[PDB]
Amino acid sequence: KMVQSNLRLVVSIAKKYMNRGLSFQDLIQEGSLGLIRAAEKFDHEKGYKFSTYATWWIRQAITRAIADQSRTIRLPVH
DNA sequence: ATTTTGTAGCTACTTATACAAAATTCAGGAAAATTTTTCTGTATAATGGGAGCTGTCACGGATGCA
């Protein structure tokens, strides 16, 4: 009831990579993945909203997808 | 009348054997060394996209119908 509760914003992020590559939907997922992870690695004790932390993990997730594939010959993401 | 042919012959004399360890190298292993690939985090806040295309057909359907 939180990961989904967010939903939007992650699409505002993923959509930035919908044109970068992969696929709007493809992205969305990826984020989602992240979303999760964040969604729980996350600590309301530091107060400031997940908007300044959830979006972190997202981004991460994503990048690791158009770089992890979307190329049909995987190269050292590094 | 020597010479070539001999015969009755060996001895020297040299392959032949086979082994043989000694080389002598090679391969594989093993690391170990290290280089390259992976993995993970990131704290103000951030909360719906892109596009357009716009000139046959057919048919069977067309359910849908009024």
Which strand B nucleotides have any atom less than 7 A from protein CB atoms? 36-50
Backbone breaks in chain A (C–N > 2.5 Å) follow which residues?
none
- Please count the other Cβ atoms lying within 10 Å of the Cβ belonging to residue A64: 14
A69 in contact with nucleic chain B (CB within 7 A): no
Nearest partner of A77 among A58, A63, A57, A60, judged by Cα: A63
A34 CA to B40 C1' in angstroms comes to 12
A12 in contact with nucleic chain B (CB within 7 A): yes
Angle between the N-to-C axes of helices A10-20 and A54-66, in degrees from 0 to 180, rounded to the nearest 10: 20
Structure-determination technique: cryo-EM
A21 CA to B25 C1' in angstroms comes to 58
Residue type, A68: D
Q: First CA to last CA across chain A, in angstroms?
A: 35
